[PDB]
């Protein structure tokens, strides 16, 4: 409980109110919540998802997109239908519809706009995601990644949560994920009691 340089609450990191009940049991989940439309979750991506293949075996990187209004359901249910369809491929799909969003402004909160997009993706198996898409377990998913964007109250984004339980404070990409890994040690620490 005594702070540590890397770990001082209000600079480094911040103690969500109520814990995010994480995905898998054993391990340290880490979770982003991100938007396809938002440029600092575009970049963070990248690095994240690199130092996420370096994660210990009791480790793992978890996303969610944040859902701050009925119209932003659609792209959530794009990043459930991307979990669902190209989890394997992940980085590359997140990678173009970024870019989509974010560079080239294409409004794929859109449904016709989302569809046709996809099924114009080579880069990444854009049929195979719209069918998930289609599919309605695709909106069952955003159904609660609106609900943890509600319950949670995250108003930001990107927002990296560890433990579920410790929001990470970025100065940059590269410093964060120190604050990840500090972060990581103090919840398995706490694991242990």
């Keep these: 409980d005594d702070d540590k340089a890397g770990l001082v609450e209000g600079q480094n990191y911040t103690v969500l109110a109520n814990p995010i009940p994480q995905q898998q049991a054993g391990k340290v989940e880490v979770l982003e919540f991100f938007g396809y439309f938002c440029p600092h979750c575009a970049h963070l991506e990248p690095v994240l998802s690199k130092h996420a293949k370096s994660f210990k075996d009791d480790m793992y990187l978890r996303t ?106 970025f100065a940059d990409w590269e410093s964060g994920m120190n604050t990840i890994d500090l972060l990581a040690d103090k919840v398995r620490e706490e694991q242990k009691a």
């Design 64 to 169: 969610e997109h944040v859902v701050w209004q009925k119209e932003m359901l659609t792209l959530a249910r794009l990043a459930a239908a991307v979990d669902m369809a190209a989890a394997d491929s992940k980085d590359v799909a997140n990678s173009h519809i970024f870019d989509a969003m974010v560079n080239q402004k294409i409004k794929l909160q859109n449904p016709e706009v989302l569809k046709k997009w996809l099924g114009e993706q080579t880069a990444f198996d854009g049929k195979k995601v719209l069918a998930a898409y289609e599919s309605p377990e695709s909106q069952a998913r955003a159904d609660k990644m609106q609900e943890l964007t509600e319950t949670f109250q995250i108003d930001g984004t990107p927002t990296v949560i560890v433990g579920g339980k410790y929001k990470v404070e």
